[PDB]
Amino acid sequence: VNPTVFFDIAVDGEPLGRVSFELFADKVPKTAENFRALSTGEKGFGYKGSCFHRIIPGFMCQGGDFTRHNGTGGKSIYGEKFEDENFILKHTGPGILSMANAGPNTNGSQFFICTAKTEWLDGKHVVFGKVKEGMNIVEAMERFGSRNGKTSKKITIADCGQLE
Numbered sequence: 001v002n003p004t005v006f007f008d009i010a011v012d013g014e015p016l017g018r019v020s021f022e023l024f025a026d027k028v029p030k031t032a033e034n035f036r037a038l039s040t041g042e043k044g045f046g047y048k049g050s051c052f053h054r055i056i057p058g059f060m061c062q063g064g065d066f067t068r069h070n071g072t073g074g075k076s077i078y079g080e081k082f083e084d085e086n087f088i089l090k091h092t093g094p095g096i097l098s099m100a101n102a103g104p105n106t107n108g109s110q111f112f113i114c115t116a117k118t119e120w121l122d123g124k125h126v127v128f129g130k131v132k133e134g135m136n137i138v139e140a141m142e143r144f145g146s147r148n149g150k151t152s153k154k155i156t157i158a159d160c161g162q163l164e
Contacts, residue, residue, distance in 0.1 A: 002023055002024055003022075004164035005163065006020045006021070016155075020133040021035075021130065022132045023129040024127075024130075028085050031099060031107065032129065035097075040160075046066065047066055049158070050064070051156045052155040054071060054149035055141060055144060057115075058116055060112040060115060061141050062111070062113075075109055083107070084104060089128070090127060091119055095114065095130045096113070096127055097112075097113055098128065099126045
């Protein structure tokens with residue numbers, strides 16, 4: 001009903017495991033369809049083969065920049081940027097999937113998965129999904145980041161698509 005998409009994670013080419021996400025298209029339809037379409041790659045571009053560029057242990061894992069691979073690019077299926085759709089949902093705990101941005105109404109393709117309750121981001125970042133299976137794989141990824149976010153290993157989305 002709400003779609004499910006998966007990411008298969010690899011650490012330096014080696015398989016790590018699969019993370020599945022429920023996307024709240026019932027509450028944030030425009031933001032969720034952008035993530036759904038970038039996971040299937042159906043508009044011609046998307047997340048497959050991209051990497052997690054910033055992982056801060058105890059806080060979140062961030063990725064989605066498939067053009068510069070470092071936090072400075074990415075694009076949405078609606079254009080360079082699109083607006084903050086709403087702020088109904090909050091950052092209630094580990095597993096929350098939320099949009100990274102550069103200020104009001106600058107959403108592109110970058111996202112982050114929280115591994116803690118990060119209530120100070122409420123109302124600044126749009127929440128649109130949550131980890132359904134594989135939270136333990138997110139915890140395992142978390143172990144390759146650091147306080148400044150830089151990763152000790154290359155974490156990539158080796159494959160991705162829609163399950164439901």
